[PDB]
């Protein structure tokens, strides 16, 4: 799980960076990348 | 098409019956919408006249 | 402007539009208005107050609709996109809807 | 003289607030690893051409290099340019004027 | 090592094309249902994953 | 049974280090992800072309030209961005 990295993957990584966790009170990160959204998978990692 | 979401689903689904599932009908809750401006002080008028 | 809705922040030109974002980072003497990977004007320096201020575009997430069959029942329930529940109706601008 | 400019000539080519990205500009810029010319204690102050731009800074010995003045003809046929230092700020100046080639002010 | 699935994306056709401009949307309406087609294809992929 | 047990256990340990070493055997995995992203980045960058218009950002075009003129500029931008979207979707389908 560590040999696969997203560091040099611009949009996906920086969309994953809408988890500032307090950094901005009102961050709707679906209104920051102009419609480009990423749905979550039906199955997590723990269940696989 | 503006009612309990069920209705707008029927709208998009183009049928007056819907099955069991989910449907993206997003961006449908009207935006904040005002009209104003901020600027500077350029007291001098032009000589165009 | 206002500082909470799509007041159309027309900061010295650019008809920037965006709710909230009372943002703050760092700039430079030349540095005036923000620009990201896609130029997305990050922040700006107000024409007559002169500071730093980023803003998120018209900030309203997306909605889908769960359903049992239309004829199975008329009940529905909506599932949004990534939005903390705190701002749900206010994050769908419930007031006018 | 002629020396390898290992890496110099990088100036914000813009005035837009930018942050952790990688932008690919396209403008006049000092060609890397290129060369330069100059002079030394010759007595000096020669003339030199301008093309489009001139990356130019130097060993300020004890501040001795003072100001860089332009001026194509100096028969006073063009209000060109002149820059030195007048306490508060440099004497930005324009007028076609004498172009006293060897600065002097008493000092 | 075998790949099994990939990232599920989706895109707001109107936001991408005419983002927030209500004069642009009325012009987009002249091209028929292209946004609907695109969203349909993307949804198909997202379920396939 | 004695030394088939050993061989097995040891070899598993090998797989462990081998992976850890740095072969990203998960290359056949990385690609996919990256490949996708690249496709996204292009799409995003495609928002700066003006496809023949006098500018790119809609807000401006709207903020400079009257509606009757706006028509031209707007339409061209629309066609350009529509084509970008179409290409992206078709590529996604193939990769799918
Ligand atoms: C412009 O004038 C207003 C007075 O209404 C003042 O509040 C503001 O600071 C001025 N801005 C300047 C001088 O840049
Ligand atoms: C909806 O229609 C299907 C098809 O006949 C039927 O099986 C189902 O019972 C209907 N729903 C209800 C609540 O009766
Ligand atoms: C939503 O916002 C509240 C208020 O700050 C916070 O306590 C909560 O943790 C947030 N939700 C998540 C999932 O972080
Ligand atoms: C620059 O000067 C060096 C000598 O230091 C010489 O080798 C080179 O040809 C000159 N020109 C360049 C680097 O363009």
From Swiss-Prot, chain C:
Top-level division of the source organism's lineage: Viruses
Positions of glycan attachment: 71, 84
Disulphide bridges, residue numbers: 6-58
Subunit field text: Binds to host ACE2. RBD also interacts with the N-linked glycan on 'Asn-90' of ACE2. Cleavage of S generates a polybasic C-terminal sequence on S1 that binds to host Neuropilin-1 (NRP1) and Neuropilin-2 (NRP2) receptors. Interacts with host integrin alpha-5/beta-1 (ITGA5:ITGB1) and with ACE2 in complex with integrin alpha-5/beta-1 (ITGA5:ITGB1). May interact via cytoplasmic c-terminus with M protein. May interact (via N-terminus) with host bilirubin and biliverdin, thereby preventing antibody binding to the SARS-CoV-2 spike NTD via an allosteric mechanism.
Task of the protein: Attaches the virion to the cell membrane by interacting with host receptor, initiating the infection. The major receptor is host ACE2. When S2/S2' has been cleaved, binding to the receptor triggers direct fusion at the cell membrane. When S2/S2' has not been cleaved, binding to the receptor results in internalization of the virus by endocytosis using host TFRC and GRM2 and leading to fusion of the virion membrane with the host endosomal membrane. Alternatively, may use NRP1/NRP2 and integrin as entry receptors.
Designated name of the protein: Spike protein S1
Organism for this UniProt entry: Severe acute respiratory syndrome coronavirus 2 (2019-nCoV)
Residues represented out of the complete protein: 533 to 629 of 1273
């Amino acid at each position: 799980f560590n040999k696969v990295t997203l560091a040099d993957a611009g949009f996906i990584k920086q969309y994953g960076d809408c988890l500032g966790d307090i950094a901005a009170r009102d961050l709707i990160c679906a209104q920051k990348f102009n419609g480009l959204t990423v749905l979550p998978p039906l199955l997590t990692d723990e269940m696989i | 098409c503006a009612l309990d979401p069920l209705s707008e689903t029927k709208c998009t689904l183009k049928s007056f019956t819907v099955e069991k599932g989910i449907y993206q009908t997003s961006n449908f809750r009207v935006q904040p919408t005002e009209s104003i401006v901020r600027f500077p002080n350029i007291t001098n008028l032009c000589p165009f006249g | 402007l206002v500082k909470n809705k799509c007041v159309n922040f027309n900061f010295n030109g650019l008809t920037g539009t965006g709710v909230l974002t009372e943002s703050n980072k760092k700039f430079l003497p030349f540095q005036q208005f923000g620009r990201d990977i896609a130029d997305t004007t990050d922040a700006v320096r107000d024409p007559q107050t002169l500071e730093i201020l980023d803003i998120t575009p018209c900030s309203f997430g997306g909605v889908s609709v769960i359903t049992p069959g239309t004829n199975t029942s008329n009940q529905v329930a909506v599932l949004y996109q990534d939005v903390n529940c705190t701002e749900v109706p206010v994050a769908i601008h419930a007031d006018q809807l | 003289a002629y020396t390898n400019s290992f890496t110099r000539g990088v100036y914000y080519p813009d005035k837009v607030f930018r942050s952790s990205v990688l932008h690919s500009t396209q403008d006049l810029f000092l060609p890397f690893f290129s060369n330069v010319t100059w002079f030394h204690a010759i007595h000096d102050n020669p003339v030199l051409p301008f093309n489009d731009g001139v990356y130019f800074a130097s060993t300020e010995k004890s501040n001795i290099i003072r100001g860089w003045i332009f001026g194509t003809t100096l028969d006073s046929k063009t209000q060109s340019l002149l820059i030195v230092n007048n306490a508060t700020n440099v004497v930005i100046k324009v007028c076609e004027f004498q172009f006293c080639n060897d600065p002097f002010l008493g000092v | 090592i075998l790949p099994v699935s990939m990232t599920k994306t989706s895109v707001d056709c109107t936001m991408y094309i005419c983002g927030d401009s209500t004069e642009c949307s009325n012009l987009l309406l002249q091209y028929g249902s292209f946004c609907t087609q695109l969203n349909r294809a993307l949804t198909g992929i997202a379920v396939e994953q | 049974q004695k030394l088939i047990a050993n061989q097995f256990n040891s070899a598993i340990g090998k797989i462990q280090d081998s992976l850890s070493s740095t072969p990203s055997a998960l290359g056949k995995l990385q690609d996919v992800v990256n490949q996708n992203a690249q496709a996204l980045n292009t799409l995003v960058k495609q928002l700066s072309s003006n496809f023949g218009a006098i500018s790119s950002v809609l807000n401006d075009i709207l903020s400079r030209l009257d509606p009757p003129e706006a028509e031209v500029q707007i339409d061209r931008l629309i066609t350009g961005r529509l084509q970008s979207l179409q290409t992206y979707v078709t590529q996604q389908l193939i990769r799918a």
